[PDB]
Structure formats: C-alpha cells, structure tokens
Amino acid sequence: SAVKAARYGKDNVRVYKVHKDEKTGVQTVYEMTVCVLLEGEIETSYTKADNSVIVATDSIKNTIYITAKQNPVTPPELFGSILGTHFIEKYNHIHAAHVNIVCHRWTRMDIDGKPHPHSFIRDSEEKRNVQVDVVEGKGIDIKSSLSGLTVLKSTNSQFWGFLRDEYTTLKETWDRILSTDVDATWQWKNFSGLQEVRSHVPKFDATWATAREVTLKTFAEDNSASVQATMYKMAEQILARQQLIETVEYSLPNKHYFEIDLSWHKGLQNTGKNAEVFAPQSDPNGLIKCTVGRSSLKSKL
Amino acid sequence: SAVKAARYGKDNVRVYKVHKDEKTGVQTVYEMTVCVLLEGEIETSYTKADNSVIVATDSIKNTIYITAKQNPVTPPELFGSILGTHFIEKYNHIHAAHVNIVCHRWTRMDIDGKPHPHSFIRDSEEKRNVQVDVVEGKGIDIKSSLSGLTVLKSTNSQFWGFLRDEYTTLKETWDRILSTDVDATWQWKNFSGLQEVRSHVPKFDATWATAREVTLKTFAEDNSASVQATMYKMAEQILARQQLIETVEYSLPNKHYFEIDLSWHKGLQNTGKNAEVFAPQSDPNGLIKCTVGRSSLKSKL
Amino acid sequence: SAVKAARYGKDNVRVYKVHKDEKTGVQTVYEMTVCVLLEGEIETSYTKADNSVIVATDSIKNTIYITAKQNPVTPPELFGSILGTHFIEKYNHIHAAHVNIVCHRWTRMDIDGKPHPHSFIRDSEEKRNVQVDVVEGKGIDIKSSLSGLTVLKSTNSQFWGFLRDEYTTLKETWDRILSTDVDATWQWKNFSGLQEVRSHVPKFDATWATAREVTLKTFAEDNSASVQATMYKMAEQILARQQLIETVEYSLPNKHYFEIDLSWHKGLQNTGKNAEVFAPQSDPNGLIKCTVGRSSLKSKL
Amino acid sequence: SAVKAARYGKDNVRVYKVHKDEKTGVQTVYEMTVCVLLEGEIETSYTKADNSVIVATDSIKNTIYITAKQNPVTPPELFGSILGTHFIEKYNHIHAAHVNIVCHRWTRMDIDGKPHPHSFIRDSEEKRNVQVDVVEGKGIDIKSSLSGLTVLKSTNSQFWGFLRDEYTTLKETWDRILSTDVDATWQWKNFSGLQEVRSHVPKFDATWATAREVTLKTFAEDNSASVQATMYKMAEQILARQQLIETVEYSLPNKHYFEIDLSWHKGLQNTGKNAEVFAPQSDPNGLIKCTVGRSSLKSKL
Numbered sequence A, B, C, D: 001s002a003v004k005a006a007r008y009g010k011d012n013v014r015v016y017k018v019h020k021d022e023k024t025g026v027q028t029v030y031e032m033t034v035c036v037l038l039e040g041e042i043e044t045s046y047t048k049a050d051n052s053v054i055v056a057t058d059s060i061k062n063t064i065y066i067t068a069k070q071n072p073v074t075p076p077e078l079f080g081s082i083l084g085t086h087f088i089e090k091y092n093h094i095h096a097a098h099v100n101i102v103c104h105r106w107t108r109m110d111i112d113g114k115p116h117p118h119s120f121i122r123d124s125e126e127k128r129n130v131q132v133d134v135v136e137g138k139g140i141d142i143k144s145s146l147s148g149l150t151v152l153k154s155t156n157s158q159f160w161g162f163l164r165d166e167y168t169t170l171k172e173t174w175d176r177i178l179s180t181d182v183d184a185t186w187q188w189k190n191f192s193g194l195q196e197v198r199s200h201v202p203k204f205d206a207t208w209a210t211a212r213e214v215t216l217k218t219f220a221e222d223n224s225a226s227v228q229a230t231m232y233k234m235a236e237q238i239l240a241r242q243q244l245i246e247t248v249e250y251s252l253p254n255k256h257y258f259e260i261d262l263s264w265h266k267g268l269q270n271t272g273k274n275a276e277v278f279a280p281q282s283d284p285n286g287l288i289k290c291t292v293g294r295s296s297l298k299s300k301l
Ligand SMILES: CN1C(=O)N[C@@]2(OO)C(=O)NC(=O)N=C12
Pocket: A159, A170, A225, A226, A227, A228, A254, A285, A286, A287, A288, D008, D054, D055, D056, D057, D058, D059
C-alpha cells in the first residue's frame, strides 16, 4: 500500500476576539469557528509511526489563537490567508494549509434608537464563510460564501412547462410559495501570496455585501419561473459587479409548502385562489445547484 | 394497576398561513409548530383496548388546520385558546386541552429601503411561544414566552464576592464577557374562558414587545453583578408594566468565554486588561433560574 | 417584587470515569452528562447583588468531578444521591439539590468472539437517566428512566374503532407499521436519605434491566390495539415486578409510516396486502403519554 | 455569463421497504434516505426559463419509490446503480445521475433468546452509505462507506515524538484514551454498466462486513502510535482483502478526553497512573484523513 492523499489538523476551534476603542468606549466583537488541515511530507506518520513530521493538532490550535492575537481577524479572507501562509512558511515540510472559517453574527444592539457600545445580538444564524487553500508554489485560492440565509416569498413564484411523462404527478402552478436556505459561493482569482491578498482587502467585505444584496433583491423582485432561473440571475449580477471573481455557485433547497384540501370538511375552500393554510414539508426537498462563470462562446451563442 | 394520568395528541404540526390584502397587494405570513394533547375520560383506551374514546391524533391534526383556516392565528395566545376551547366543547368526554405553539420568525424584507409586499427573511431563530391549558370548568391558563434570544456583552459584567471554600478555584472578576440564550416566560392571570381572552387581545402582542424591550435594554445597560441580579431586574420591570401578569420566569445559561494565557509564547499578553482573544466554551455552562411575583410581605421587608 | 422560586447550578458537565483491574487487565468505562441545580436561602443573590450566598457554578462543576473521583459513579441513582446529599450537608443554607444524569453507552467490544479488555462501542444512542431530588428534611426522590430506545415492528399493530366525526379522515387499519422512541420512567418510593438508597443499590440496575426487557418483549409480542393499550401493558408488568416503584410513566411518539399509492403508474399495487414501499413521515407525529400506578378502587372496579 | 456546472434533483427522500416471507412469517425491513441529482443538457432551464428540459424533482421522488417497488433495495450499491441507470437511459438529454443513499439500521430483536419475525431495534446510529455516479458513456463509479461508528479505548493509545517548537504545549504521553467516530470509504473499480455491477453483487455486503471487522479489530488490538498509524493499518488490510477496491479513505476525529488535576483539593491524585476521572472535550477536535491505494514504487521503496 501507499498513501495517495493525506491531510490532518484541528477542527471546530471556537475563537472570539474583541476590539476596544479606549477613546470612544466602543467595543466590537468577532466570533468564528476555525478548521486548519495541513498537507506535506507527512506520509511516514501513517506508514512508519514517524511522529517527527507531525505538527501536533494541539499546536495548530495554539497557533490559531496566537495568530488571532497578533493580526486582524477580519475580513476572514485575510485572516485565513495569514494563518495558512504561516504554516507553509514556518515548516519546510508542510506544503499546503487548508483553512476553513465560519463567522458567527454578533450585530450591535440599538437601545432606545442608539447603537450600544458593547452589547450584541445574534440577529440571524446566517454565516459568512471562507475556504482558503494556501499551496506552496501555487499561491492562495479563496472561496467566500454566505450560508443559512433563510427566506420565503408568498407569491410571484411559478413552476409550469416542465417535462410530463408516466412518472409525473405534479400539477403545474402559476402562483406558489418559494422558500429556501441560500448557500452562495464566489470563487476569487488565484492570488500569488499574502501581499496580493492584502492588496485587495476592501473588496472582500464589499463583495460579500454585494452578493447578499443581489441575493435578497433578486429573490424578492423576480417573478420566478423556477429556482434555476432565479438563481442564475443572481449569479450573473454578482459576476458583473466584481471582476476579480471567476465563478459564483448557488446551492438552494426548494423547501416545499403544500396546499391542504379541506373541501371534505363543510365544503371549506383552501386551494388555488382560496389557499390560505399550508403544510410546510420538512422532507423531501428539491435541491438545485449551479456554477456560473463568464462566457467565452463567440459563435452559436 | 390504574391510570393515574394520561394525555395524548398530535405533536410537531407545522402550519403556515398567509393573509393577502387584495387592495394594497401586501401579504403577511405566519408560521408555527403546534402540539395539542388532550385529557379526559380516556383511561379505557389504555386499560380495555377501547378506541371509542379516542379522538384520533390524525383528526386532531386536521382540526388544527381547519381552525387556522377559520380563525386568526395571531396573537398565538388567542389561536391557542380557540383551538383548546374547541376540543373541550366539541367532545363531552374531553376535559382538558393542552396547546403548545412555537411561532417562527418571518420578518418582511426591506429592499432598496422600502418594505417588500411579499418577501420575508428568517431574521433570527428566536421564537415566540405559548402554552395554553384549557381546562373544563377551570378556564384558560396561558404562559407566554420568548426563547432563543442569543446575546453577548463584551464588558460591564462582573462576578466577585461569591462563596470561597475548599471546592473553589474560580478567580473573582471585575470585567468579563456575559453571553446567554434568553428564555423568558410571563404567566397570565387565569381567564374564565374564550370571551375573557378575547377581551385582552391587544395586551398579548404589547406584553411580548415589553418583555423583549426590557430584556434587551436591561442586559445592555446593567453593569451586572451576576446573572441572578440582572435577570431579577428584568422580571421586576415586566411585572410593573402589565398588571394581568402574575409571574415572570427567566432561565438563562451562562455561556462562558475563557481567557487564554499566551504568556508561554514570546511573552504575549492576553489576560486581564490585555485580553483580546478568548475561547468560547460549548460546555459545561452555568444555568440560572428564577420565578418572580409580586410581594405580599408587610413586615421584615 | 419577590422571588417565588429559584434554582441555579451547572449544566452539561461531561464526565468519564475508568475502572482498571490491575490483576486481570480488564478496564471498564463510564460516561455521563451531569446537571446539578441548587435551591436554598439564595434570594438575596437575585434581589440585593449578594454573591455571598452563591456556591459558584464553577465550584459545583469541581465538586462533580471530585465526587466522581471519591465514589462509584454506578448505579447513577447512587451517584446522584451522594452528589445531592453533599450539597445539602456541606452548605447550611442550601436546602435542595436537583441532580440530573444522562448515562451514555460504552458497550465492551467482542473481537474474534471474545470480550476485549479495554475497547468499547457506542452500540446505541439510547440513554439511561436519573433525576435525583435531594430535599433537606424530606429525603431523596428518584426517577429513573430509559430514553431514545428506537424500535419498529412491521405488522401486528392495528388501529380501528376510534371516534369518527366530521373532523375524521383516517382509515381504520388491521395491519400497520408501529415505530416509536421509548421514554419510560419509574418513580421510586421516597428514600429517607443516603443510607436507605444504599440499602437498595442492587435494585437499581435490576429494575432498569426489567423495564428494558418488558418494554422490548411487550412491543414485539403484543398484537397492538393502539399505542395506548400496548404501553399500559408494559407499565403494569414493571409495577408487578418491583414493589419499591410507585408509578411508571411512558411517553411514546407514533412515528408514522404512510402507504404510497402507486396505482397511477402502470397499475402498480402498493397498498393494503400489497404494500411494500412506505414513506416514513418526519412530522407530525402522534404523542401518547400515561402514568400508571397501583389500584386502590374496591368497588365499581 | 454561462453555466459551467449544474445539477439538480430531490434530496432527503425517506424510503422504507418490507419483505414478507409468507411461508415462514419472517419479515425483513429496510430504511434509507435517498438523494438523486441529475446532470445533462439542462442549462436553458437556468438561462432561458426553459422548463421543458426539467424532469421535475417531484417526478424524481416518484421514480425513487417506483424503483424501490420494482427492484431490490439491497445491497445499496445495486439499488443506487439501478436508480441512476434509469435516469440516463429514460431521458436522452440526461447524461449523469448522482445517487446518494444513507441506510439506517433496523436490527432484528432477539426476544427470550430467539430472533423475532417482525420486530426491530435501531441498535446504532451508525450508517452504511453509497455514492453511485452513473455517467453516460463512462459507466458507474461507486464509493461505499460506513459512518457514525463511535468507539473508545481506555488504554493502548500513545502519542509521543511529535514536532516540538515555540508553538507547542502538548505533553508527550505513553498511555491515553483514544475515541473517534469512524468514517471509512472504499472506492470500487469503475463498472462499465449495470450488468457488471450485478455480476459483483455478493462482494458489496462482504466488503462492508470486512471493512467493519477490520476497523473494529485493528482499533481494539493496535497499541496505537497515533491516529495516523492506526488508520493506515486498517486501510492496508481492507485493500489486501478485496482486489476490486482501488482506494480506502478514512476520516477520523480525535475526540479528546482531558485529564483533570485535582491536587489542589485535599491532595487528590487524578493524573498519570492515578487518572480515573476525565473531562470529555466537545470541541475542538483533531481531524485526521488519508486515502490509501496500492503501491507502484519499484525503487527507493
Ligand atoms: C416543484 N419543483 C419540482 O418538482 N422540481 C423543481 O425543484 O423542486 C425544479 O426543478 N424547479 C423548481 O423551481 N420547482 C421544482
């Protein structure tokens, strides 16, 4: 036998950091969950009981906290790049570091109409994430995402004109509920190293904000022909607004809300135009995915 | 043997309802999870295989949807009272109905600064709940609550002066993080029936809003001596603002954020006044409870 | 305002303990999650910022580990009684201790047909639990339970003869699937203190084993008229087998498995006698409860 | 813009099937959760609101149930291959079907020492899974796995000789607890189509049993130098026992159990040779991965 692939490290590292402005009194908090997995000349730890090549996962954990003490933790694209770069530079035999960060929301409270200096609310379980792959000799590849953004619209969603054959029971509809949990990812151009990442730092928060804004406005305003059609519009708009993005990926569940025929009870009308009470379905669910990039077709368009 | 207690029914009934204003185009959505458990002269279903006394849980489910079609689903205190009253009135042999409702957030989206007519966001997993016990001959007992309201403050929390003995290792502190998930319950005066509940309908939304406002402002502004002291202030204020409440209960976890001593690494200072990076602890957690009512002591105060 | 009720302590305390037989080499492991909440003369911690009356939750945590080091952790009824007794004896002003323990399964592995001396498998997420309320001057009240025991039978379950009215759509059935997650609790006679608990120690493991055995055999062998009828048989048998039990409580979800009519597709027959493929329903679910004790009726039986 | 990748379908489809032997009375149950995602000439559903190319996810759901009615659902490798093959054969424009199946345990109960004909227990949340990718013109690629197999050994685990530098605090140990949740995957040789899969049907259950047996015996018997070293031994043995496997992958968390120094309390000794009570850590956790295949090095071995 031989090792074909290997990576190892510390997962589920919870990290909080506070910034305190001693002049103004305003404090700002950041909370995340971090995973760092390393690759390199480590195969003998598996094949030969050679622990000398292992940077202990406990030490990886220590390093995450040390790095958060010595550097900004925002934007997460930057923090992940600093962290990953550290491992490949510090350890000759480590050649890749894979850093995943989930950022948790702590939104400043407004009390009596004024932003409070040191009190926060988890205003959504929506996350902002990064995946930062730092690969020695091949730069830094970053995928940024938002996830867990749960939305519903009560009309202005349709689904008709789909294939009908002997497996089909679904009724066409011209007016349905649409609800999803948005997972949207934007994949950056490869960066050559930490200097190039740093040169683009403002673009990270700006692109996350654009992606969120586009997602919400397109969901709310598109008289949707399908999940497929709506999500494509989102992606095309994000690509148009940040040239340093190469692709946008969406993964959207179709969280079904079924009509309930009550006509068996006193002739109650609760379908079609009279549908008011619905049964949210926990499972199953449609699951619709696509990855959109910029076009390069020049004929047969 | 004999049956000492029994109740049965349908749990985990997911319910959506939409209201459509055909004049304005504005739609409003409501989503909940409902449980109804019944008591009464049912013991022979357990002891004698006598199914004649069972109103099937499937029929209870149907009834929940029918009741939502025929009545408002808001405030949940009212919906639960209507639902519970139905079972004790419809079925001679059913003498109590226990209705639990969890209300899920669907907050209207603002798009380009304007409220959208039919698009919503799950802006928090915080819930608004009710427990409505309708007991034939003994009226309607309602407990209202908010839960899953997750908050953090980065300073203005203290914990010193606690008992110290041979089991104690905890350091006193004059400046710590405080974070919790608020579960707050207000227990209404017994209502004689559905008419009395209906007579107080505006008070339900108003009291929920007061409880939330008080919770947030007191958390944010109290330079807290302990979870105990802060939660008591919340409760006393809610009682002062609604005379139809008899008690207020809080159940608060103390979600610990530990300092991380980094002085072993290059003399890094990350404790006390220099604490910036902390380790959120998933478990264990303090858990602090109290039920506050109005005083009746007249001496030894 | 005044404090009507209060309790506080440490929740979610994970505890492992190993026993090592140095003669035989056999090791035995125990893992639990513990909660201890205290009551007593503590109201001034809430009303007056008086921390002097607080035994810190951190110290409660320390105490749990110390108590596990100095005493057996099995049976959990005993461990909980020792732990609770400690708080009311050690602290004059603490008058009740409420100890909840969840015991996690670590079943010894059999390797090549032989029990291994130090390797274990989590063979089920089923739990064994206790609730031990130690109340100064009023002894020790113990509720023991098993929970998370998930079972299914594919036939020999029926449900017919239930009430039918204008809310009813359910078809009677003479052959259905029955599946549940068993939560069964046996409530012990009050014990006067720790000596009386210790005097009954073998009965704890024996009664847990009886309750489990009865549950499984009755589920498997009863040609069930309803969940109600089957669960009552379980309870009556457990009561008959341990006189120091006062009541047995069951709480059982009815985890529905729906037939799927496929006759629209090529005349496929998948209902009634030809039902082979079913749709497990995640929600909603029936929920059936009862508490059974011994009879005291002497006429009208 | 243009669609670079797309797939869609139905996720979280719960499926039960029963087999009834009418001669013997013995019934056998199967329960799974299925996901099917399709690829093909579908881009216009995203770009052009062209629903004609969409086989509705509702119809995919119907098809899963129909296929389970008309075919064996075991082994899951076979069921997934039949299901995936159906979509690429039935629909000219669909060119890949990605079928994921999670199989849930329903183990036959033994009652009074005899296997019961129709009663089952969920004896573990361990799963048996498949990932079956059916790609038109490129056969069928199958990855089989077991997951959620949670184990602990109380001794015969070590971790010493790891890299030590200025980021390291971890103590070397010659005797520790090792606990994990095993996720093990074996990747089959590409199959040319459904006939080739069918030709190997007995190997699926046999290889799953081998993988489980090897996992448990190696975990229990290896005096482990590290998670890395132990998992490699597992993989090499599985490869040696099934030549139609190309690779074996393990992904193992290191679920830490920390010693608790109690020497501050009455000189209690609970570390090193006297360690009996430990604190299971929920997070963070090591995470150790590798993919093992057969060797092709002929020099520098
Ligand atoms: C109702 N429905 C389907 O049956 N398939 C679809 O995904 O769930 C699909 O392909 N697109 C939809 O928007 N709606 C759907």
